[PDB]
Amino acid sequence: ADGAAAETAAPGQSAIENFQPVTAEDLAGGNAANWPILRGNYQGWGYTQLDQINKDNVGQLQLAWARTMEPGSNEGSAIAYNGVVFLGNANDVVQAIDGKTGNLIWEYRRKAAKRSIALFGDKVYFVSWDNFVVALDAKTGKLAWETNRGNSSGPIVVDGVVIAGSTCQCYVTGTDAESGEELWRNTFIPRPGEEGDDTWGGAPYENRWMTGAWGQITYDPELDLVYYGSTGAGPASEVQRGTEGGTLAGTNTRFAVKPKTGEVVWKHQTLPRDNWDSECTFEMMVVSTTVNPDAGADGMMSVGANVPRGETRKVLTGVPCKTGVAWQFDAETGDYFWSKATVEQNSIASIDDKGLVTVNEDMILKEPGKDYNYCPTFLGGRDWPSAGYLPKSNLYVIPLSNACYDLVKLAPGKTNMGRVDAIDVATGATKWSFETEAALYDPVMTTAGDLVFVGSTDRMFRALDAETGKEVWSTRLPGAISGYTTSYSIDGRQYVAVVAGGSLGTGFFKAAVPGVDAVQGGNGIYVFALP
Template sequence: MTDFSDSRRSTLTTWIAGAGACLLFAACAPRDGAPEQAAGPEATFTAQAEAGAASYAANCAACHGAELEGTILGPLLIGQSFIQRWGTQTPALLLGNIQSNMPPGGAGNMTDEDYLNVVAHMLAMNGVDSVSDALTDASDFTIAENISRIVALRRPMEPPAPQGLTVAGNTEDFVPFTPLTAEMLRDPDPADWPMHRRNFFGHSYSPLDEINTDNVANLRLEWVWNMHEGDSEPAPLVYGGIIYLINPSNVIQALDGKTGELIWEHWTGPANRQDMRNIAMYEDKIIQATTDARLVALDARTGEQVWETVIADNSKGFANSSGPIVADGMVISGLAGCARYIPEDCFVSAYDADDGELLWQFETIAEAGQPGGDTWGGLDDLFRAGGETWITGSYDPELRLTYWGTAQQKPWVPVSRHMTINDVGLYTNATIAVNVDSGELDWYFQHVPAEALDLDEVFERVLIDRGDEKLVYSIGKHGILWKNDRVNGEFRGFTETVFQNTFTHIDPETGAVTYREDIQNAQLDEWTSACPSSAGGKDWHSMTYHPPSGLIVAPLSQTCLENAAREVALVQGGGGLAASRKFFEMPGTDGNLGKVGAYHADTLEEVWAHEQRASLHTGTISTAGDLVFVGDLDRRFTAFDVNTGEILWQTRLGTSVQGHPVSFAIDGKQYIAVTTALGGTSPRTVPGVIATEITYPRWGNAIYVFSLPEGLN
């Protein structure tokens, strides 16, 4: 699967050249007759903003609206929602985000100056009026602090979001509440789904079998609950018949799992509509990592806040998009937003579940003088960035180890970070095993050193016992299923789940990868093709392990990209992602972007696979009823036979099916729940460029709950 012939390369080049007519955002690219950028008389913010108005009109307005008001093709870029999302960030971070992702079909004729001008135009339209100097790629002032009070009052504002408990209630009115102990988390009740991926090992498996291969065709909708709008990849928790649900804008809700009735709702804030995936539960608390990098505990019975602590300073770009895991009374959290050149690095940290007190912190970036500090090409510690832990880890209570994936170095390409392909940058793009009692690193395995294409290996670690072997499995954006000993990290094997041409060789004994020569030597502004794309392979959608069959079933993506590195200056406050990208279909897939693949945990051989045009947007879950459930962009929620891959049931929901399905039981009756949602980063953007015929409403976040009719259960 690692060969990439000249003829195939030529075919792809031809495909890319002719793809403009079928790109969703083709209307957002430069158009014939569009106004040309006006050259500013001098390098000032005002001159940039004026020039940026023309660049925006030519490249962005068709999707985001002439006045930044948003359309069905692109979100609004003005007003309180935009300020809530970007007000605490810097122009440099906003610039990096736009350069890396917009327009999704590639930058076209846009230059670095064009991008800076567009950012200046966006900021000016949002009321930034106390900046005089021209923006640069290192501009590190806080955006909201440069909007004067007069301009802020003049700009139309949305009503301020509420804070705290907005709907009061008590779970005692629905079911008697029993605290969820550490022992109960080690061996969850079959009726519950009390943590993300259900157990410490991350199996995403339910031991319930009332719904099975014989009767799943009779599934019907029990109830539906509309959620708050915004980007969302929710993973509900279910305990004692109550569903605890994370919404956009950092809103937590408790719902009666039988009827969908709202029990309580708490607005933690900020109301910024950023992606958030999961929450945690322990004893009588719901514990949430917020999008602005705080940790908040709520009373699970009433929704009232119990304690709050700060994980990291959000004004410096730090954030969270996934929640914690609670290991024997310790709340263990990851961290995102670590692409800037600042003294602080990313880390995994643990807190006392009773009061939020910090217990320990392990930094994922090795600094000079530390073990691994010599793997960063001699860069000053200030310029070592990345290593985010933005997907919730797993935990082995017996070994007292928590397992996390780390993201790659930043910027994305070695030449942009002033390094070479030989500067591996520990502990990025690795599995790290951290002792929960001391916070010290027990072992690490770096899957893809010196990652060069935004293909990180950060995703969930699934812990599996096979005989006497204690193993850990993972799949990253490269689409490689890795198998390691979870006691010491020793490499045990791999398999390629989708076509990849990034590596010319993967050592079957050590797992060491060898990049293609052109990727190794990629220079600034030089386009390099690679498969898979930054959507994966596999992305944030979690895979499932089905113990009865020994199968790992993963939701996969089949797309490719072209990537071009941008120059990044080594200045404090700079950094970022610094690459332009284009996306295209993966060769040999007949245009099928989505794949569900089943692999045996012992041999890693593919047992079955299902491919389809629509990309997959939920994790997979499996059940003792020999079923696998998954949802997709085309609004379909599907049940497969876990042993054969046969489709046994399918329904179509209100918008794209996105998040993490769960299964639970109340009074002996089994339910299946799944969410519809928007957002989702690259897995959403990339299919939008390629599969333009797939349409869905740009609203409709909801949770749907299914069950069998009475008499069939």
């Protein structure tokens, strides 16, 4: 009862009433009420500053609303912006949903997994199944433009440049956010003539290929540096590749690049000679910290020769590969500060004090009758499920799997498959570790309420105490908690949104841990809030 007519908003065929264009400052985390990019900010923190939900009341969390999502692998994220959730579904379905009520607003359906869409200005951006960079009108969901390049993690947009990697089975492109025009494209495999071609064991260029889903891009505004990682070469066996002895320059390399041009500023290969599908493409965070690595910390591999001990530095830090080794670099220069193993791993025999990795020759397939007991696995260790950062305690919080595989089983001495480590970013010391019988295989979200949210393959959605790792709240969803957790605020109410239902990884871990009720189904966004 406004006018005498019934004003309506037909779900799926409506427009956002008030859409404000998304800025660089939004994407840098400038509005705690929103979660406008995969990890909450450009810098990859996976953090919300919202603290209405905290250690004291999280035990009271209830289900506010949920909504069914497309069937298939459900690894996506509830991107939230001024009361609207922008939700990438499987099968290139993109929805705008009222973040308070769960009413569908609009739905774009293109003619599997989508980990995120991206926001910038007045448009919603994603990379489709048929390798188009696509822009939708944010307000209405109508197609604005699409450019055929020739993904699963989703782009980010930096100052009007849509940056998007590629699934390799291999490049990263920058595309104008308003016109659709491709601006640049970076490739990784050196051609004979370029530096590094001699690291490919004599394999002819036309027979080299890379393989791996492309990972999460992060960004530092002040340095104006985009960070991504490249994957390994395929197939995984260097004998089958014809690259025996080859360290494979270009592969499994962390790049820092200029967003307007793709120009490479610094790079560092975090895993040469990959024989283990290590995919060093996962998110690396930009954080400021005192630089004080403890050479005697558990798992520490080496400390950089001239590390700026005691100084404050903006660093690029985190675990880039399935191997589970955390790295820390100077964000601006790429100077190597330190590296630290987490899970049991035996593909890296050592890392010297300049960050040069030496792989374990004994884990390279040579004799077919020999036993090759590799740790971790093609699922990690870590995998694409993202870490989170707790700026209040300077902790890097990463979900892991305690697994090993014959080159899928629990690692030696581990009864719990699922694991979350919290690592001091200043010292590299592990401050706490949460473990549980089922594999997690799901991102975390860190919060200013001193909480860590994480889901599991046997459907448990948990909040951990960020100071101790102890579980303080849990619920259980219809299927494996397979997607991302985000948080946003509307009318003073903090919402915690998680995407669940199952993924490719759900079944591999249903097999290794036979005692847990890991099952797929009920794809959906599920949103929690206090009473």
